[PDB]
């Protein structure tokens, strides 16, 4: 009565307009009463200098804290009132702004999101108040071994380079970042171009259009002659981080080797090379049955409390590995295995896993955009990224096409007596050496 | 399943904003999974 | 007489002199010590008793009274269904590998 | 758009470990005559006229 | 703060093709580890003879 | 674009008692749910844990499947099989792309109709019981509300959702399959889907889910007692929740407190907002400079309910935050109550409801615990009337039923400074 | 601790007296679980420092002479600074239910009632033998409790 293939060409293309100052505006029509609009950014601490690292980051503690036209408190109390929900987020590259909604409030909504982005107020006082919660995040952030192992692992992949700070930037920073650096860098990134005004839910696409139409005309489209911020490639160095603390129960070690970047078609074969090894912890009932080898051993030989496979794509590189957590003397054994799969993968993937890894990656990507705010910002961030949304029917062509000689070529291309970059954090006396890991590459 | 939990089990707060939302203000759900890691809410 | 002969050949065997069940002398390959592991309780100490008999009198070159032999109409497979499931699950599995 | 020559090996010949150790074994073959030979040559040329090979002519025809 | 951590410069130990951090490494990795495994490779075959 | 239909929810109450229950969205994957009043009410003193032993042995052999078939053939067509437990139901899901339901669909039927229960693979499974707690409790609000639910309650909605730990290695299979077929019947089932069609869900639950004793063997009502529970553990921040019984699902009193909930403050709307339309929070606030949160508690049943507050302080404030968040709802059950909050909390919560049920997730939730609470469907648009409906002064009213009830409490943290119900 | 909890009155007269009491009597005679490992060398010495004073100590002796216990007090013991001084017990009255499954359950239930020294103490000691405590014939039927 409808094969999944007749599923996919039903779902609403995504509506995309443009506003005259440059400003994308992109949604998709759903029958929910609810729904998600936003406003994404290509700005991120990869735009930052060491100067300013952190600024982006410092521009998201006082977005919600009052605008020219509703000061202080005012701008939160209009959200809460209405039942709406406002949240953010900022990466290397992109930063986010989007409220959850009534449809029959995205008038409202457009109009706080515009203002948001234009009339922030930066109060002085205000500054000051978040230079120390920042502080104190910073302080939590480094209680998080994950959080931890992530940024040492693009400081030491991508050093030298912006993409090796992190989002929150040293803490050096946040304490000498002035209203002058959040202003320079606000001033400098948040231009209509380089925006993306996303929604999804119960509205019309034109109904959009005319709140943007009327909300983010105003928004600059221009930025002097050398203000346009344009990224540069980032070197990827083949390089190992090792915090070692004995006093730390558990050990994080998390390997990459450099990826291909969001627009290559390589990704693709690549999550579904990710999907067979896939992840794990401790909780997971399939044990000793799971499909992937390495879930399997781990799990019998109990190796690790946990591993995840991933793929952080960035404009024109990013990081192929993963990430696991074990005991001090499962180190070498974790690695040993990972290591084996990938090579594995490169050599002999069969078509039965790869058939499994592309069944896996299809139930991710659809379960995955359920609900407003999953698909509004896979519009927003697909627009930033490919510069258009790919539809599910697309994604399912390109999936289609992957078969275990597309596996065991990408994985070759991209694993394959390649050199990684690798961070540990922890008791990592047994982390192996960085030449062995290496030969483990072939 | 394809989708690997937001927190992954293994066997934080310094401010006031990493506090907000702590609070319980519903039942407890337990889940256990055979591909996705367990989780508690509320 | 088929039977007839298995009787005879029971006994010509002569592991039941020693007090020993057929299942006790099966020799034990992967799949046997999964069943044995599976065994309830009783059966698994009751199995242990009747091996330690039984190396007992190999030890002294004796065997048992008679009386005390175990019968050829009594023996009965007590590990058969335990190692039956585990054969069958190992090929289901193997099968999944050849996949 | 142009390869160097050790990325043209690695490619060719060093990434597979097959290749790379058929590069090793005509290698060793190809290797062996022509060190061998010029290794010989530079002896006798050091040595001209000095070993039976030089002089061997003067008592042959038996 | 762990974001405070920043590698150390290395520019001083890097292979000359890979000294600009705005350039990427892909490039010229073919290269790099041709050589090595040419070293390699010859010292097989002279070790073999 | 324009919507894919939008149809309706399709309902069907078979003979036997078993409701099913489908919405075709057309989506490229289903979601199927079998609901059960299986939760952990339901153990008396005698097997307390063996409904979370359940939960994590839905991967175990059946009699049509192997417990590596199971794990193995899910996977292949890369599916998902969950278990999810609340103090009374149990609802087992399976995703997976529509071509492959029928495929999640048998899987599902063997763990919850064919469980075998093996003896060797049931004692290799009790360890994973003390990883699966370690993990939850490693929450303080998991050993708060399970605390609270022990104070609250002398039996039934007492039982936590996890194994006491004198029972790990305990739990028998005679006692599992006594726990499915006592409660694993007709009558206290619903199979809810989404995104596959009503006939089909129907052909599977009539020719796969019958088994008489429908109503099976439900338990005791919920007897409120009240009492505490203190955990002292030395934690910088105390966690301590205070609660009165309140109203069972379903009743007009139940939405009374919904709304009161919202009045209070019910969770943060903006990130690293400062809760500026929360009652509770306000009221803390401004009294206490110390890092703090705290929110309106509201946990309703089938026979029962519990609505309070939760409160996260350091350990030398948890006195004030508690007894500033109690004042606060002191004075709404005085009267002092703005029909401008009332409105601000129906929003919310209207709001909150619909953004609840958007993603499939949510929404077989939602229609599985109707299926099961009130053998009914009642649509967004009944809520939200049924949401307006509730008076100002019912809002008051359900304030004062928790000031002068009988309190129930439970903390953990340093407790030095953190007082007794009888101190409020 | 897992040696005394062995006795389930052990668990039974610690849980008591916490549910008996706000604070101080509150308080068990054994170190919580989550403190094992984490009590410190300053903790020790100041508990000692504070409650190890003159004041606040008996030095009694059996088969030794007063004098020489004396002299022993006199120039050993003369200790101040302690804190002679606690918190007054609060009885508050509550309940701690341990479920364990033993087949057999223990359970006491009791009221506050007097200070020791006090001449109430002495009804409640009275009464305590009317009700009964403890067996006077080995294996007996206990006909006057
Ligand atoms: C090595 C020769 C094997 C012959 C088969 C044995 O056959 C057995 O022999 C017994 C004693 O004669 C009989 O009592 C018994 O009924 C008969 O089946
Ligand atoms: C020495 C060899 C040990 C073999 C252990 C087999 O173990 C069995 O494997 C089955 C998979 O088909 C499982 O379904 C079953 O629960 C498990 O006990």
């Known amino acids: ?442 | ?42 | ?99 | 758009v142009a390869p160097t020559l050790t990325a043209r090996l690695y490619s060719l010949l060093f990434r597979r470990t097959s290749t790379f150790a058929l590069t090793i074994v005509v290698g060793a073959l190809f290797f062996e005559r022509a060190f061998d030979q010029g290794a010989d040559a530079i002896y006798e040329h050091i040595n001209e006229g000095k070993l039976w090979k030089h002089i061997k002519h003067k008592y042959e025809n038996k | ?49 | ?424």
């Not at chain 1, 019998?300 to 990081?319: E, H, M, R, V, W």
């Not at chain 1, 990656?361 to 627009?383: K, M």
């Open chain 3, 1 to 99: 007489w088929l039977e007839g002969i298995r009787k005879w050949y029971y006994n010509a065997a002569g592991f039941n002199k020693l007090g020993l069940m057929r299942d006790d002398t099966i020799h034990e390959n992967d799949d046997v010590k999964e069943a044995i592991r599976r065994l309830p309780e009783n059966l698994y100490d009751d199995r242990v008793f009747r091996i330690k008999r039984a190396l007992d009198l190999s030890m002294r070159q004796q065997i048992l009274p008679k009386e005390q032999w175990t019968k050829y109409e009594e023996d009965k497979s007590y590990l058969e269904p335990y190692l039956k499931e585990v054969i069958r699950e190992r090929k289901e599995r193997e099968e999944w590998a050849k996949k």
């Open chain 6, 1 to 424: 674009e324009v919507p894919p239909h939008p149809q309706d929810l399709e309902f069907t109450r078979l003979p036997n008692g078993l409701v099913i229950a489908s919405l075709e969205n057309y989506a490229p994957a289903s979601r199927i749910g079998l609901f059960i009043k299986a939760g952990s009410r339901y153990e008396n003193s005698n097997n307390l844990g063996t409904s979370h032993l359940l939960r994590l042995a839905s991967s175990l052999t059946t009699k049509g499947a192997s417990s590596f078939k199971i794990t193995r053939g899910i996977e292949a067509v890369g599916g998902k099989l969950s278990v999810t437990s609340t103090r009374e139901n149990m609802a087992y899901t399976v995703e997976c792309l529509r071509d492959d339901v029928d495929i999640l669909m048998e899987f599902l039927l063997n763990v919850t109709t064919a469980p075998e229960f093996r003896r060797w693979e049931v004692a290799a499974l009790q360890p994973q019981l003390r990883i699966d707690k370690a993990v939850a409790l490693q929450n303080p609000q998991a050993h708060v509300i399970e605390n609270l639910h022990a104070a609250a309650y002398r039996n039934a909605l007492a039982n936590s959702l996890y194994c006491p730990d004198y029972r790990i290695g305990k739990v028998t299979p005679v006692e599992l399959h006594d726990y499915v077929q006592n409660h694993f019947t007709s009558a206290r089932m619903a199979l809810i889907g989404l995104g596959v069609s009503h006939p089909v869900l129907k052909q599977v639950a009539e020719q796969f889910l019958n088994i008489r004793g429908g109503l099976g063997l439900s338990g005791a009502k919920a007897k409120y007692h009240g009492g505490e529970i203190r955990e002292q553990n030395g934690d910088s921040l105390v966690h301590a929740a205070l609660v009165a019984e309140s109203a069972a699902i379903g009743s007009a009193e139940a939405n009374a407190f919904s709304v009161l909930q919202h009045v209070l403050g019910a969770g943060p709307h903006v990130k690293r907002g400062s809760n500026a339309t929360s009652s509770l929070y306000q009221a803390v606030a401004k009294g206490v400079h110390q890092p703090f949160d705290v929110s309106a508690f509201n946990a309703s049943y089938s026979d029962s309910g519990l609505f309070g507050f939760y409160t996260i302080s350091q350990a030398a404030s948890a006195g004030d935050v508690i007894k500033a968040a109690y004042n606060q709802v002191k004075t709404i059950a005085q009267g002092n109550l703005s029909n401008p909050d009332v409105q601000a909390a129906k929003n919310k919560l209207k709001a909150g409801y619909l953004m609840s049920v958007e993603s499939s997730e949510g929404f077989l939730d939602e229609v599985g615990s109707q299926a099961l609470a009130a053998g009914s469907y009642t649509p967004p648009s009944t809520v939200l009337q049924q949401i307006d409906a509730v008076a100002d002064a019912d809002v008051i009213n359900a304030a004062k039923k928790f000031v002068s009830g009988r309190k129930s409490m439970a903390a953990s943290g340093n407790l030095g400074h953190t007082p007794f119900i009888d101190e409020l």
């Open chain 2, 1 to 42: 399943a394809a989708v690997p939990a937001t927190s992954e089990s293994p066997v934080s707060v310094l401010c006031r904003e990493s506090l907000r939302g702590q609070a319980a203000g519903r039942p407890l759900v337990a889940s256990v999974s055979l591909n996705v890691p367990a989780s508690v809410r509320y």
């Open chain 5, 1 to 49: 703060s762990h974001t405070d951590i920043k590698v150390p410069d290395f520019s001083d130990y890097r292979r000359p093709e890979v000294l600009d951090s705005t350039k990427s490494s892909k490039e010229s990795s073919e290269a790099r580890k041709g050589f090595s495994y040419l070293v390699t490779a010859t010292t097989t075959v002279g070790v073999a003879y």
């Open chain 1, 1 to 442: 009565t409808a094969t999944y293939a007749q599923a996919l060409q039903s779902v609403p293309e995504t509506q995309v307009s443009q506003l005259d100052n440059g400003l994308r505006v992109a949604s998709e029509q759903s029958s929910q009463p609810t729904c998600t609009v936003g406003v994404w950014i290509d700005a991120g601490s990869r735009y930052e200098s060491e100067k300013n690292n952190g600024a982006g980051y410092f521009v998201e503690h006082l977005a919600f804290k009052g605008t020219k036209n509703r000061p202080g408190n005012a701008l939160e109390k209009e959200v809460e009132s209405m039942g709406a929900h406002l949240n953010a987020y900022s990466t290397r590259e992109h930063t986010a702004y989007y409220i959850k909604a009534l449809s029959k409030d995205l008038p409202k909504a457009v109009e706080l999101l515009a203002d948001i982005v234009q009339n922030c107020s930066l109060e002085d006082s205000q500054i000051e108040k978040e230079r120390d919660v920042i502080l104190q995040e910073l302080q939590e952030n480094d209680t998080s071994m994950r959080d931890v192992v992530f940024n040492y692992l693009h400081a030491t992949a991508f050093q030298g380079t912006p993409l090796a700070q992190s989002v929150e930037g040293p803490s050096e920073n946040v304490r000498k970042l002035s209203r002058a650096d959040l202003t320079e860098y606000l001033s400098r990134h948040y231009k209509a171009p380089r925006m993306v005004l996303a929604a999804a839910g119960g509205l019309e696409h034109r109904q959009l259009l005319d709140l943007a139409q009327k909300h983010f005309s105003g928004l600059s489209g221009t930025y002097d002659e050398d203000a346009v911020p344009t990224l540069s490639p980032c070197r990827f160095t083949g390089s190992q981080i090792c915090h070692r603390e004995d006093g730390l129960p558990l050990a994080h070690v998390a390997i990459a080797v450099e990826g291909p970047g969001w627009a290559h078609p390589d990704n693709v074969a690549l999550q579904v090379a990710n999907a067979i090894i896939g992840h794990y912890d401790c909780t997971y009932g399939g044990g000793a049955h799971l499909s992937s080898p390495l879930a399997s051993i781990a799990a019998t030989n109990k190796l690790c409390q946990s591993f995840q496979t991933f793929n952080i794509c960035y404009a024109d590189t990013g990081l192929l590995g993963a990430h696991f957590v074990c005991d001090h003397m499962s180190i070498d054994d974790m690695m040993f295995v990972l290591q084996g799969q990938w090579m594995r993968l490169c050599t002999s993937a069969t078509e039965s896993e790869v058939l499994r890894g592309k069944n896996l990656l299809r139930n991710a990507l659809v379960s995955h955009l359920d609900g407003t705010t999953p698909v509004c910002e896979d519009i927003g961030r697909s627009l930033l990224t490919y510069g258009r949304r790919i539809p599910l029917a697309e994604w399912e062509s390109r999936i289609a096409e992957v078969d275990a000689r597309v596996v065991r070529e990408v994985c070759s291309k991209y694993f394959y007596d390649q050199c990684p970059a690798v961070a540990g954090f922890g008791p990592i006396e047994q982390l192996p050496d960085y030449n062995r890991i290496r030969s483990g590459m072939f």
